[PDB]
Amino acid sequence: VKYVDKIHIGNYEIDAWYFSPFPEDYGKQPKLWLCEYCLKYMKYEKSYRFHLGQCQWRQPPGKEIYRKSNISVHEVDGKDHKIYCQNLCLLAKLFLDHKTLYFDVEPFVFYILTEVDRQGAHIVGYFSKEKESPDGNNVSCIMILPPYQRRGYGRFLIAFSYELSKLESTVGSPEKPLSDLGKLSYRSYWSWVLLENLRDFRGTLSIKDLSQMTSITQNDIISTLQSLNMVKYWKGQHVICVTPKLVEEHLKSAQYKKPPITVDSVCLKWAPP
């Protein structure tokens, strides 16, 4: 171990995927030990165990803006909770090749997804978002920790990010480049959402209509619809072209059959800043 290559967080030991610039001294130990509630990183099992008996945090800081049953989202502003956000960024960089910002967190707001039991709210993943995005990015980085990947939580967070964009009356797209798992996940999310809308209306949904209803950009609707072969091109304009039956054929594919953890807008508490 000369870079950090293994973390212990909660009950999980996880191998790193990429370099993250924890301080040199921390990379020297066999494992880096993180408090799963405050995200403090520690060099020894003994300092970790002492910290677990002392730390009073049982959930992320900031404001719980979503709660439904034992699923919750906390909104944490990088200026109000700098240390927690820097800790989160160095933890994320272990799984993200392309994240480059770890310390200058004050331009960002972080949305932390947790799953709650009688012990406290256990981190699953997060996304960051620029407070002011000139490019209309509604996610900067998005990361689900390995033991929760491919289990519905990424789909919930991507949906969540578009729920905020809807409340802001704006469209938005993730910042590129996307990670490999992020690309597959966005493509599957957009397809599901657009197909479900195409099934529910009939029904002069234009591409514009779909962008207003979903907060998905026109370009990302178009590239999705191209991949489904649901668009024709006429004198310089992409136009929707699909039958009710074709929409149902798509939606009967294994990929759309897992039951989603849904985002209930009744349980989201948030207004634009």
Ligand X SMILES: O=C(NNS(=O)(=O)c1ccccc1)c1cccc(-c2ccccc2)c1
DSSP per residue, 21-71:
---HHHHTSS-EEE-TTT--EESSHHHHHHHHHH----S-SSEEEEEETTE
Taking CB under 6 A as the rule, does residue 151 contact ligand X?
yes
Binding mask 30-49 for Zn ion (x = CB under 5 A): -----x--x-x---------
Site for ligand X in 162-201 (CB under 6 A): 179, 181-182, 185, 188-189
Crossing angle of the two packed helices 180-200 and 244-251, in degrees rounded to 10: 140
Query: Which range, of 1-9, 47-55, 136-144, 213-221, touches ligand X by CB under 6 A?
Result: 136-144
Taking CB under 5 A as the rule, does residue 9 contact Zn ion?
no
In terms of C-beta density within 10 A (0-12 exposed, 13-18 middle, 19 or more buried), how is residue 156 classed? buried
When binding is defined by CB under 6 A, the residue of 152, 163, 223, 270 that contacts ligand X is 152
Nearer to ligand X, 140 or 238 (CB): 140
**Nearest approach, Cβ of residue 191 and ligand X (Å):** 9
The count of residues interacting with ligand X (CB under 6 A) is 19
**Residue 211 in tokens:** 């962008």
**Residue 254 in tokens:** 């294994």
Cα–chain-centroid distance for residue 245?
32
Nearer to Zn ion, 107 or 120 (CB): 120
Site for ligand X in 77-106 (CB under 6 A): 95-96
Chain positions contacting ligand X, by CB under 6 A: 95-96, 142-144, 149-155, 158, 179, 181-182, 185, 188-189
